[PDB]
Design an enzyme around this catalytic site. Structure first.
Site: not given
Ligand SMILES: [Cl-]
Ligand SMILES: Cc1ncc(COP(=O)(O)O)c(C=O)c1O
Ligand SMILES: Cc1ncc(COP(=O)(O)O)c(C=O)c1O
Ligand SMILES: [Cl-]
Lengths: 386, 386
Positions: A39, A139, A272, A320
Site C-alpha cells: 500500500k 480502529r 530567503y 520549494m
Molecule cells: Cl485495524
C-alpha cells in the site's frame, strides 16, 4: 546512463528485497504463508515492480489500502489474491467483485446489502470477504463474541459472498513490554474456539506483522503480513536489538550539482530571509531538490548531504525546489558532480533512520512521503532498468 | 453526489482564483503583464485546470520548475509561453526546442554549446532564453556587470537562440525591514543602465513576486510573477496587515466517517503505542486519511477536525492511512457523516495558516505536500467536475 532534464532520482535495489524475503521465510514455521504489503505506492518504493518481484520469490497474496490501489495491480498483469485493509464503501461492491478484490467487512448490515446488490445483477462473481476482529487496536472491526457469531451466520446464508479469512492486529508488538500483546492473543484464541463449539469450520487465520513475526514466530498460524521488513527497515530500534534477522535497505536518493561559485562580490546573503552570510572565499553549490519533493523544511541550516565521500551542510533556508550547500573556504567542486541525499557514498552514510531521528518521527513516514514527481529506477542482478 | 471507494477528497474553487487575479490587476500599472506560477503541481492544487482558468482571466505566461512539468501542460493543449525557473541540463536542449519551452541561462559556455547542438541538427526552431541576474538571492544567476556583458555578447552571436527576457529575485520583500530590497533594486537598475550605454536594447524585464507586487507596485516594470497570491494565501503576516489587497482561499480538504462505536468492552486502548485510553461511554470515530497523504504525524494527540460545526480532537497516534477522533461521552454521529479537515464548516474554520503555525513552518509547505493519491474536484460557478 541516467539522462534527465532536472537531475534528481531514486534507486530501488531489488536484489536486497529478495534477500529480505529469504531471511523471513527461514524464521517462521514452514507451514505458514506470506502476504506482502504494498500500500501507499509500495511505502514510497513503487507498488508494481516490488509486488511482481515479491510474488516470484516467496509471497502468495498481496495487501493494499484501497480498491483503487488494487486495480492498478490487476492492470499490470497480476492474478494473485489482493486484500483491502481499510473500509470500502457499498457503492464499490460491484466493481470489487468485477476485478476480484478481497474486501474486509465486520457488520451484519453491510453483508446483507452487499449480497442483495450482487443478486439484483447476476454474474458468477462471488465477492470474497475477510472478517476483522478488534482486540485492542481500536480502529476497525468487531469486538464481542456474541456480535461475531451474528456476522458469521449472516455471511454463511449469503449466496453471493464467500468467506476466505479472519484476522486481528497488534498495537504494541514493537515494544519490550509484551503485556498488551499477549492479552490480545488470548482474546483472539478464545473467540475462535467459541465458533468451534458451535460446529463452525474456520478459514485462513492471520495476525502477525513484521515485529510480531520476528518476536513471536509461534503466532504465525496460516499466514503473516510482511510490510516494513520487505524494504530493509526495522519496526523499532528495539526489534533491531534482538539480532534475530538480518535485513538490507533497498532505497537511496541522489542528485547532481547545478552551479558552483565564490562569494567575492557583495552582498554575500544566501536564500530567503538572508539567514546565512558567506565569507569572501566561501564556495556555494546549488542542488535541485526542495520541500515540495518531500525534503523537509525543518532541515534549514541543519541537514547534510554527501559530496565526494564527506558530509557538507545546508546553508540558508530550504526552498520549494532547490537547496544550497557550503563547500567551505578554498572550495573544490564542479557543475555535474553526483551527491547522495539518503544512502551510501564510499565509506560514508546518511541513513533514513538518522533523518527520522533528527525530525522526531519514524522511518515509515520519511520514505512514504517521497513525491511521485521523482523518477524511480530499479536494479536487479547488478543492472538498471525502469 | 461524490461517490468514492475510499472517502477522502480535495475541493478547489476556481471562482476564488478569478477574484484573486482581478484584485492584483487593479493594483499594478496597466503596462505590466502577469505571469502565473504553477510549478510543483500548481502548489498542490493541480497544475492543468488552474493554468487554463488563469490564462482565461488575466495571465499571459506561465512558470514551472522543470521541462517535464511544462510537457504535462503542452499535452493538455496549452500554447502560451512557459519559462523554466531552475537549471536545465544540455541533455534536454533538443527536446525543449521541439516542445517550444523557454529556459533560463547565465553562462557563456552553456550558451555556446546549446547553440552548437541545434546547429549540427539544422533545426528550424529557435530556443528562447531568459537571463537570470543574482543581486542578493545567492541561488543561481550572474553576479557582476562585466560578466553579464560577456553573456549578452555570446547570446547575441548565437543564431539559433533568441533573447526574450531578463530578471532577478527579491530575497526579503515580505519583511518590515526594507533595506535589502531597496539595495537589490538599485544594483539591478544600474546593470541595465550599464548595458544601455552600449547601444544594447533590452527585452521584457521582471523582478516582482507576490509580496513585492503588493508593497512596491512601482517595481512592476514590464511584468510580475504571481505565485502564492493566486491561490489566495498571503506571503507573510506583515504583508497581510498592510490591508492593501483582498484575497480569498481556494482549497478545502474533506472526508466521510468510516465507523462508529462505544468503548464498552475492555481493553479501551486506541491506536499504536496505546497512548490514549477511552472511557466506557466514550464514542470513537475512524477517518480514512493518514501521514502518507500528507497529514503530518506530528499532529498526533494534537490537531482537530470539524464535525457538525464543532472542533473535535485526534485521539492517539496518526497512522499511514487512517486517524481516530473522539466524540465524547454518548457523542452523536453516524457512519457516513461529512468531516472537514482544512477549511470552513457551518460557522467554524480551520485555516491552512493555523496548521502551519502549529507545525512551525509556512503555508507553502502545507499545501504543496498533499499527495497525488487524493482526488481533486473543481468548482466553477458553484458546481462540480473532474
Ligand atoms: Cl485495524
Ligand atoms: C493490518 C496491518 N497488517 C500489516 C501491516 C504491515 O505493517 P508493518 O509495516 O509494521 O509490517 C500493516 C501496516 C497493517 O495496517
Ligand atoms: C524565482 C521565483 N519567482 C517567482 C516565484 C513565485 O513566488 P511567490 O509565490 O512568492 O509569489 C518563485 C517561487 C520563485 O522561486
Ligand atoms: Cl534564483
Amino acid at each position: 546512463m541516467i539522462k534527465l532534464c532536472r537531475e534528481v532520482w531514486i534507486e530501488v535495489n531489488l536484489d536486497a528485497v529478495k534477500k529480505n524475503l529469504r531471511a523471513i521465510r527461514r524464521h517462521i514455521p514452514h507451514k505458514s504463508k506470506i502476504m506482502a504489503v504494498v500500500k501507499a505506492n509500495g511505502y514510497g518504493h513503487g507498488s508494481i515492480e516490488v509486488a511482481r518481484h515479491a510474488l516470484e520469490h516467496g509471497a502468495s497474496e498481496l495487501a493494499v489500502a484501497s480498491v483503487e490501489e488494487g486495480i492498478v495491480l490487476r492492470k499490470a498483469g497480476i492474478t494473485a489474491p489482493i486484500l483491502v485493509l481499510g473500509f470500502t464503501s457499498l457503492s464499490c461492491v460491484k466493481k470489487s467483485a468485477a476485478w476480484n478484490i478481497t474486501l474486509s467487512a465486520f457488520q451484519v448490515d453491510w453483508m446483507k446489502e452487499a449480497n442483495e446488490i450482487l443478486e439484483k445483477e447476476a454474474s458468477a462473481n462471488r465477492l470474497a470477504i475477510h472478517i476483522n476482529v478488534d482486540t485492542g487496536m481500536g480502529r476497525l472491526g468487531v469486538r464481542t463474541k456474541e456480535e461475531l457469531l451474528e456476522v458469521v451466520k449472516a455471511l454463511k446464508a449469503s449466496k453471493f459472498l464467500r468467506w476466505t479469512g479472519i484476522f486481528t492486529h497488534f498495537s504494541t508488538a514493537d515494544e519490550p513490554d509484551t503485556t498488551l500483546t499477549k492479552l490480545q492473543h488470548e482474546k483472539f484464541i478464545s473467540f475462535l474456539s467459541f465458533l468451534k463449539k458451535q460446529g463452525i469450520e474456520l478459514p485462513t487465520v492471520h495476525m502477525c506483522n513484521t515485529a510480531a513475526a520476528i518476536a513471536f514466530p509461534e503466532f504465525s498460524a496460516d499466514m503473516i503480513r510482511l510490510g516494513i521488513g520487505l524494504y530493509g527497515l526495522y519496526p523499532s530500534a528495539y526489534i533491531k536489538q534482538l539480532n534475530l534477522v538480518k535485513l538490507e535497505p533497498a532505497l537511496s536518493l541522489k542528485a547532481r550539482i547545478a552551479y558552483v561559485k565564490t562569494m567575492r562580490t557583495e552582498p554575500r546573503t544566501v536564500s530567503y530571509g538572508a539567514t546565512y552570510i558567506a565569507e569572501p572565499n566561501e564556495v556555494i553549490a546549488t542542488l535541485p531538490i526542495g520541500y515540495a519533493d518531500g525534503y523537509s523544511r525543518a532541515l534549514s541550516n541543519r541537514g547534510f548531504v554527501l559530496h565526494r565521500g564527506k558530509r557538507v551542510p545546508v546553508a540558508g533556508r530550504v526552498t520549494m525546489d532547490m537547496i544550497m550547500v557550503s563547500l567551505g573556504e578554498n572550495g573544490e567542486g564542479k557543475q555535474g558532480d553526483e551527491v547522495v541525499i539518503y544512502g551510501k557514498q564510499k565509506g560514508a552514510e546518511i541513513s533514513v533512520d538518522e533523518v527520522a531521528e533528527m525530525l522526531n518521527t519514524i522511518n515509515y513516514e520519511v520514505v512514504s512521503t517521497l513525491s511521485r514527481r521523482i523518477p524511480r529506477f530499479y536494479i536487479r542482478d547488478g543492472e538498471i532498468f525502469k
